[PDB]
Symmetry: D2
Subunit: 247 residues, 4 copies
């Protein structure tokens, strides 16, 4: 690939990629960082295996992407209220979309994982949008969705940095399409979900100790796999803030 | 009701009505005819019980509504190729919509019917449209459907005489929504059909000898009931022509 | 028809019928009553037009069918707590199926109705069962449904008097199929409901003053039509009790 | 793991695994082979990376599993009519199920692959069955499916070697459930397919040169990913025969 400061091993031909040849415990210069971010924007989700960093180093790193909020809930490691831990989102979703302004991204970090199982699967909502017929794109271009646990977001959002359109709806937080009856709203959204969760649009992340991963919370969805029952899974994550999604 | 030359007994509060106090075998004057037609346009389907007319009288009558085509197929009574007889449309549909210009209306006439069973059920596609949320109306306003057995018609049509919008799609003749993929097209149309065939939008016509009925082939659908197996059902019908449906 | 003491005018070829030639204000002898009941069992729903009876006469009449319970809720005419009045069941259903022992039947009586609209539609759940393939009948023969507002009933019930099998489920009161997951339960029941609410299985009752109607609450469903907004509709009904439904 | 002659790196906690520490170009002894096969039966799909074998060696290897048929169609490398090549099954399916006796297994072998993309995804039909409620298992235990391009197979099959029950239906070859109407058959199968193609039941195989993979054609399904457009993908495969599937 066209990348001189980082090695870059794409996971599928649709999203996801792996990054090596960089010590995350050290500071990185503009041209190394310009590459890391240029990658994250093209692949949508990126991971860095065998990065034995510290929580302070975890924060700084996240901050490079954008301001570092705590999510209220979750339990932050006491000492680091920006760094929160993980040990129901086995339905595909993206995170905290009931917020006027949900997270741009999240950076996740493997502490103690199982040998196998406890994968995380992601999918591309650029792709989901992108595979709708021009006629269907037009038909729902201007619709809005009500997300809750309360707010409204557009059904198709433009990425603030990259300007690609991405379909934006998820079954965990989306009540209905504003202005439609429920029979109507249900009808569409179900189609749109059965369409986005196709296997062609997905990828699967294998979890290995001190791997550090970043996903774009606007233009992907993701889901936990429950195939580890019995085995300890302990990861941490910081949350980076984004503007209000828009069309 | 507000009707001085014809008695008028509405079947439901959504469509359909019954008309008496008029000898169909005689000619009718402007103000009697102005009423018959003013009714047909409000009720969408009308019937006239115990009208022992002749096929010539059947034609003239139809012609009052508009030019009288034969449908190729069907079998016309030999002697009257405009008058065709009846003895698969047990799915709801409207007639011959695969035509660049389908029938405006049809006039049907009971020769030998059963005592009961062999009803005909109709429904209102004004109502179907009318009960869609303003937001959903807008969402599909500008879509087109491909009808076959080949042509395109709009998904929402304006009535040429009355100017009411009416949803216009049917599962017997409609392949798909132009420009959409089949998974997409299927999704909508199924909703739209499951929505239009609601019981609230329907009515049911009881068939009795020398009853003469007229239905509006643009803004209704209709379906045969198969509950007469064993009993003779013989009706005739002329077909009145309409312009190309439009939005 | 084969009926010497009552005139009997079947509404469709699937269910429903009309009964005249009997003064309901008078007592009726075994052979007249033997006919009324022999009809109710074949047609599933029966009506008697222009019966200007009294509430006491309404009770006695109902009692001929079976014991006369009050439903708690509903509002009984004060003076007659067995006689309850009517002025959400616009979804098809049958009545009070959340009871260990729901009503066998109900007798309804028209006080002040509109000229048209405010029909009541019924359907046959004998027919619904009856049109399932032998293979599908077998597949769900032994299933149970959980009904609530709490109890279990079989999915296919045998009529206590007639011994015809009837499909027995309804979307207003049925939570799920016992033992199945919700994705599973949903799947079937939706099919079974989309199948039973077909138009071929239905009929529609026209409501006229002092008409008195009886429906079989085990083997039909029924639904109110909302096409009278603005017009006064006042009917009364007594409720006749039935055993626990069984297979 | 409990394996002394082969190294064994499970792909997910549901199916699939990777096998190293064995030169496939050499013969292997009972206890090494007893392990390879004991693995294939537990993981359902297995792969061997960086095995630069020959087509004769490819055949012998396959034969160890069972007799080696050609599939008519496909194009066999001229010189080896048992060894067939690959360069519509982007719907999930299993192979040639329209046969009275479909393939037990297939062995596939990577010649020239892309750097990334052109993955193959598999899923477990043990798991699919296994996650149905006991009540639903019972409900469809005894059903049959008609497969075509013509034959009948059971909807739930017992594995001839292992004796685990596995759900057995696929949307590419299955017409309908025998004895049911199409509305009925459609209803179930759609549920069963929407249920089996869940992400939790899947895995994804990364393709790398001279990797040799074996999948169990009775108890998995699999699907091609179209994310390589432009890049050369050339694999070969032999096909191993199985008895008629049974319950
Ligand atoms: O726990 C994981 O694997 C990530 C899944 C998730 O739902 C989240 O926190 O966004
Ligand atoms: O035969 C009838 O009852 C009318 C039904 C019909 O499909 C038609 O000719 O349009
Ligand atoms: O009010 C009616 O028309 C009868 C409908 C109904 O839901 C009932 O009381 O069972
Ligand atoms: O070509 C592949 O990736 C295997 C997919 C397939 O459909 C097959 O041959 O069974
Ligand atoms: Co390098
Ligand atoms: Co340093
Ligand atoms: Co690596
Ligand atoms: Co420290
Ligand atoms: Co900050
Ligand atoms: Co869940
Ligand atoms: Co707010
Ligand atoms: Co609501
Ligand atoms: Co689907
Ligand atoms: Co889904
Ligand atoms: Co008059
Ligand atoms: Co004259
Ligand atoms: Co009359
Ligand atoms: Co003559
Ligand atoms: Co003419
Ligand atoms: Co049909
Ligand atoms: Co043309
Ligand atoms: Co096509
Ligand atoms: Co529906
Ligand atoms: Co429906
Ligand atoms: Co329908
Ligand atoms: Co008499
Ligand atoms: Co007296
Ligand atoms: Co009468
Ligand atoms: Co009194
Ligand atoms: Co009593
Ligand atoms: Co309702
Ligand atoms: Co109880
Ligand atoms: Co539950
Ligand atoms: Co349907
Ligand atoms: Co329905
Ligand atoms: Co070893
Ligand atoms: Co050697
Ligand atoms: Co390896
Ligand atoms: Co050689
Ligand atoms: Co052989
Ligand atoms: Co395809
Ligand atoms: Co055969
Ligand atoms: Co067929
Ligand atoms: Co689904
Ligand atoms: Co799915
Ligand atoms: Co699917």
């Amino acid at each position: 690939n066209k990348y001189r400061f980082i090695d870059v091993q794409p996971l599928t031909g649709v999203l996801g990629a792996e990054i090596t040849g960089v010590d995350l415990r050290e500071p990185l210069d503009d041209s190394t960082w310009n590459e890391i971010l240029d990658a994250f924007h093209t692949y949508q989700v990126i991971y860095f295996p065998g990065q034995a960093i510290t929580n302070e180093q975890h924060i700084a790193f996240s901050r490079r992407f954008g301001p570092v909020d705590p999510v209220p809930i979750l339990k932050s490691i006491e000492g680091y209220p920006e760094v929160q831990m993980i040990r129901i989102g086995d339905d595909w979703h993206t995170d905290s979309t009931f917020l006027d302004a949900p997270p741009a991204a999240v950076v996740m970090r493997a502490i103690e994982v199982p040998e196998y199982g406890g994968d995380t699967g992601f999918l591309s909502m650029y792709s989901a949008w992108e595979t709708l017929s021009p006629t269907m794109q037009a038909t729902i271009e201007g619709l809005n969705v009500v997300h809750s646990a309360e707010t409204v977001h557009p059904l198709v959002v433009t990425h603030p940095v990259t300007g690609r359109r991405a379909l934006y709806c998820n079954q965990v937080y989306c009540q209905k399409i504003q202005g439609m009856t429920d029979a109507e709203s249900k009808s569409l959204l179900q189609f749109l979900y059965e369409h986005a969760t196709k296997f062609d649009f997905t990828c699967r992340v294998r979890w290995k100790k001190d791997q550090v991963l970043v996903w774009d919370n606007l233009c992907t969805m993701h889901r936990a796999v429950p195939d580890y029952a019995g085995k300890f899974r302990y990861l941490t994550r910081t949350t980076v803030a984004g503007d209000k999604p828009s069309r």
